[PDB]
Design a protein around this ligand. Structure first.
Ligand SMILES: Cc1cc2nc3c(=O)[nH]c(=O)nc-3n(C[C@H](O)[C@H](O)[C@H](O)COP(=O)(O)O)c2cc1C
Ligand SMILES: Cc1cc2nc3c(=O)[nH]c(=O)nc-3n(C[C@H](O)[C@H](O)[C@H](O)COP(=O)(O)O)c2cc1C
Ligand SMILES: Cn1cncc1[N+](=O)[O-]
Lengths: 219, 219
């Protein structure tokens, strides 16, 4: 809630991508719903919250993922928890989805007419999102990477390890989770995944480009 | 480094988007560098780190932004620090950019060949990123939203308020920054921005969809 600079830097050095989990250690129900709160509470362009979290604990569905999920093939066998983050498809400014967003903010017919104009200008001319489905979807998916990041960091502050995952066939992952009836494929699609658990190896050392290469100061 | 579930929950609850900053209060050099380290230390797909952070402290450059940055037009004057995050354009697997990525990990001719095969599978087959230029830029831009999230969370842990920013004309933010020589527009493009400072009003109440509609457990 309040940390020193030393405690902050150590929080982000200690967070590593964990490829090897101890299958004997499970995350408690309490710890993991806290990790999920970190995602839920995440900021979100125009409060859109365009995410759904699938917690994949069924072991046979994990096995069914392995043939197309080379980026996590062994982690699927040993991680405590697997989260697949979906992102909202077709989140147009004039959609029922954004009517839900305005309703959660209590906007009158006037404030709605102002908000929709702002949504429209953000989507249509600021960010050029309405070119095709993929560009609008990728806008929501970006918001979900905020939720992903916060879940990795909250987990690590709880002493729980994690690993973000893009290494899988996205079309096959979308099909397989839709055929289990886990989400409506016209409404949502897979954005990114993450495993969680307790590492079985030492933390690898951070390798990054230096601060002088990634930062540019304009005084 | 290690918090409790209540500590973690308030760390993410206490962060909110600040639209009103105290022009009298400035972030320390040491406090901000630690914020920037939270970004630098963020995870990224295949270690790509496809970001650059422009810290816009120049006051008259901030003024040029106001005509096309309605999302932050009040914050521009009073915020302590403004960061504009760029994402790499054309980060193709076979590009010089990924030679740097492989170099930073010290990969032999055989290890580079395996890594190149994995990057190609990821980009062409799994995520279908080579459809056009926007799909590939939007992938790198997603990674930058991880960096963005961690900087907001690091700020909040240091007592520093923040607001993430998409409310500007991207076309005109790009050209304004590129014509002033701050990045190469064929190599990078604006992804998202964020202000940092100390709030001048009260923290508004968190409003989020309930955990029971954003989470679906699969047993
Ligand atoms: C969105 C995203 C997707 C990633 N996908 C995978 C993956 O499928 N499998 C994996 O082992 N690592 C994956 N990584 C981890 C990166 O390779 C890792 O973040 C990077 O090499 C830096 O290492 P560090 O996170 O340990 O600091 C992914 C990272 C991100 C942010
Ligand atoms: C990527 C991103 C871009 C945003 N752009 C803006 C913006 O331009 N101006 C602004 O005032 N708020 C902006 N917001 C803030 C959101 O409106 C805010 O996160 C959301 O309404 C939830 O409120 P909270 O962050 O206070 O919890 C942005 C949020 C995100 C994550
Ligand atoms: C992204 N990805 C996919 N497979 C492996 C990775 N990695 O980040 O090393």
């Amino acid at each position: 809630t309040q940390l020193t600079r030393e405690q902050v830097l150590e929080l982000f050095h200690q967070r590593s991508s964990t490829r090897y989990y101890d299958p004997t250690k499970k995350i408690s129900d309490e710890d993991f719903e806290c990790i999920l709160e970190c995602g839920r509470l995440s900021p979100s362009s125009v409060g859109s919250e365009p995410w759904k979290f699938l917690v994949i604990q069924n072991k046979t569905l994990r096995e069914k993922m392995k043939p197309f999920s080379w980026g996590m093939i062994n982690q699927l066998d040993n991680c405590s928890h697997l989260v697949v983050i979906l992102a909202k498809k077709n989140a147009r400014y004039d959609s029922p989805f954004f009517v839900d967003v305005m309703a959660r903010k209590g906007l009158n017919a006037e404030q709605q007419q102002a908000a929709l104009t702002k949504y429209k200008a953000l989507q249509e001319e600021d960010m050029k999102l309405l070119e095709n489905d993929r560009t609008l979807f990728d806008w929501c998916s970006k918001q979900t990477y905020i939720a992903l990041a916060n879940m990795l960091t909250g987990a690590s502050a709880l002493g729980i390890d994690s690993c973000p995952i893009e290494g899988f066939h996205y079309d096959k992952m979308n099909e397989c989770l839709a055929e289990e009836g886990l989400f409506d494929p016209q409404e949502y699609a897979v954005s990114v995944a993450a495993t969680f658990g307790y590492r079985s190896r030492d933390i690898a050392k951070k390798s990054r480009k230096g601060l002088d290469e990634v930062v540019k100061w304009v005084g």
